[PDB]
DNA sequence: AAAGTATTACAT
DNA sequence: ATGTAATACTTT
């Protein structure tokens, strides 16, 4: 069992907010990420979109509005030792 | 239509 | 994967 998405500083930071919530919808994601980190609504989206494109996260259009669901669970950033 | 929340593309 | 941008759908 290894890490699928390549984690970084900005990569992990957003995951934390998604994991804080059960899953997350763009308003909760942006609303949180914008207050915590610099990143504007534009800036925020790459960490979501590219991750999804490469398999880190997965989006789903749920009944009301959409939910971004963590496509990773076992890994959830494998911080290797020096 | 406005405001808010969702969705994907382009450039780096 | 990261930063930045554009556009659509949903609810009000």
From Swiss-Prot:
<dbReference type="GO" id="GO:0005737">
    <property type="term" value="C:cytoplasm"/>
</dbReference>
<keyword id="KW-0678">Repressor</keyword>
<keyword id="KW-0238">DNA-binding</keyword>
<dbReference type="GO" id="GO:0003677">
    <property type="term" value="F:DNA binding"/>
</dbReference>
<keyword id="KW-0046">Antibiotic resistance</keyword>
<feature type="DNA-binding region" description="H-T-H motif">
    <location>
        <begin position="6"/>
        <end position="70"/>
    </location>
</feature>
<comment type="function">
    <text>Transcriptional repressor that constitutively blocks expression of beta-lactamase. Regulates genes involved in antibiotic resistance. Binds DNA as a dimer.</text>
</comment>
<keyword id="KW-0805">Transcription regulation</keyword>
<keyword id="KW-0804">Transcription</keyword>
<dbReference type="GO" id="GO:0045892">
    <property type="term" value="P:negative regulation of DNA-templated transcription"/>
</dbReference>
<keyword id="KW-0963">Cytoplasm</keyword>
<comment type="similarity">
    <text>Belongs to the BlaI transcriptional regulatory family.</text>
</comment>
<dbReference type="GO" id="GO:0046677">
    <property type="term" value="P:response to antibiotic"/>
</dbReference>
<comment type="subunit">
    <text>Homodimer.</text>
</comment>
<protein>
    <recommendedName>
        <fullName>Penicillinase repressor</fullName>
    </recommendedName>
</protein>
